[PDB]
Amino acid sequence: TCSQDLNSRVKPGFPKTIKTNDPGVLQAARYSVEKFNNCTNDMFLFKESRITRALVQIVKGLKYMLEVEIGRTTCKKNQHLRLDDCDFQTNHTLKQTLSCYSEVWVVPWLQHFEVPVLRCHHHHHH
Amino acid sequence: TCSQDLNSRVKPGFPKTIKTNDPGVLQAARYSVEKFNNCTNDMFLFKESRITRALVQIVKGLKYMLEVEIGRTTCKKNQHLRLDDCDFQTNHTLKQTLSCYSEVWVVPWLQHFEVPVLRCHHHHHH
Ligand SMILES: *[C@@H]1O[C@H](CO[C@H]2O[C@@H](C)[C@@H](O)[C@@H](O)[C@@H]2O)[C@@H](O[C@@H]2O[C@H](CO)[C@@H](O)[C@H](O)[C@H]2NC(C)=O)[C@H](O)[C@H]1NC(C)=O
Ligand SMILES: *[C@@H]1O[C@H](CO[C@H]2O[C@@H](C)[C@@H](O)[C@@H](O)[C@@H]2O)[C@@H](O[C@@H]2O[C@H](CO)[C@@H](O)[C@H](O)[C@H]2NC(C)=O)[C@H](O)[C@H]1NC(C)=O
Ligand SMILES: *[C@@H]1O[C@H](CO)[C@@H](O)[C@H](O)[C@H]1NC(C)=O
Ligand SMILES: *[C@@H]1O[C@H](CO)[C@@H](O)[C@H](O)[C@H]1NC(C)=O
Ligand SMILES: [Zn+2]
Ligand SMILES: [Zn+2]
Ligand SMILES: [Zn+2]
Ligand SMILES: [Zn+2]
Ligand SMILES: [Zn+2]
Ligand SMILES: [Zn+2]
Ligand SMILES: [Zn+2]
Ligand SMILES: [Zn+2]
Ligand SMILES: [Zn+2]
Ligand SMILES: [Zn+2]
């Protein structure tokens, strides 16, 4: 499986630290939680709640490597609700947070984004 | 394409800096150049020459993210030659170096390694 770029015209980028409030980082964390909502069957939408760590790598575009917390909101899935206007669950029985790692590839000049990696963990209540 | 680990039993690891002379890093850089030799058709084998940057991430094993330089050796390909005993080209017309980025996944308890990403650049002689 030699599907590699082994004679690249550009020197490949290495991941570098980036501020966790960088507008690009913030948008990448939104993509991540949207990938999560798309890929699960909760009755509520989740929303990014905290970005603890972030790296960005140049690869024909921007690849974000993110450590992001996501939380259940009070907005139901499948009602065409926008996450910017969703607040987190207050009800303790409905409060749920996950710790995720994601990689998000964004090519703004081609209007393209992808979330090729998303790993999430809900910690046991014991 | 929801082929993700979204209900993981473990909190996912984030990539952390690791020393570029760490024995695991050194072995990962060897895997990278071996992936390079496997995936190209030079008449000589290449060998890792310098590891400039390294991150390691815990993901059911160790994933290395490496910035590694590779160089052409005087050992011919397809002669069953071991890289530890190969020295770099002296002949200026045969000297060739590439800057690579690689990701190498190693699971030592399962005797498994993989090089899922390798990107390499030969800088123009102008
Ligand atoms: C967004 O999700 C759909 C997958 O449909 C999914 O429903 C989720 C809630 C979850 O349970 C998931 O496991 C389930 O498959 C994706 O479309 C699906 O993709 C797979 C593989 O490509 C196809 O085999 C399915 O037929 C297809 N189903 C439908 C209804 O479209 C979609 O790819 C995904 N998008 C992204 C970008 O993640
Ligand atoms: C190691 O390389 C071989 C690929 O054979 C290659 O020869 C190289 C020098 C290079 O020119 C490359 O582009 C060429 O394909 C891999 O086996 C091949 O894999 C592909 C896809 O899996 C198959 O379609 C080929 O039929 C198959 N060919 C042979 C002769 O086996 C092999 O996967 C690769 N190994 C690794 C781990 O990178
Ligand atoms: C919280 O949610 C549960 C289940 O939907 C419900 O039984 C309970 O009444 C709710 N409590 C409050 C105060 O909203
Ligand atoms: C270097 O290699 C080239 C091509 O193989 C050859 O023409 C030349 O004689 C070599 N020079 C020396 C000093 O080895
Ligand atoms: Zn809609
Ligand atoms: Zn609000
Ligand atoms: Zn919980
Ligand atoms: Zn697109
Ligand atoms: Zn936990
Ligand atoms: Zn052999
Ligand atoms: Zn020697
Ligand atoms: Zn050169
Ligand atoms: Zn294996
Ligand atoms: Zn260059």
Swiss-Prot record, chains A, B:
It comes from the Eukaryota. Keywords: Cytoplasm, Disulfide bond, Glycoprotein, Protease inhibitor, Secreted, Signal, Thiol protease inhibitor. The keyword Transcription does not apply. GO terms for biological process: immune response; lysosomal protein catabolic process; negative regulation of microglial cell activation; positive regulation of myelination; regulation of antigen processing and presentation. Primarily expressed in peripheral blood cells and spleen. It is found in: Secreted; Cytoplasm. Glycans are attached at residues 38, 91. The record marks 13 as: Reactive site. Disulfide bonds join 75-86, 100-120. Homodimer; disulfide-linked. This is Cystatin-F. It comes from Homo sapiens (Human). The chain holds residues 25 to 145 of 145 of the full protein.
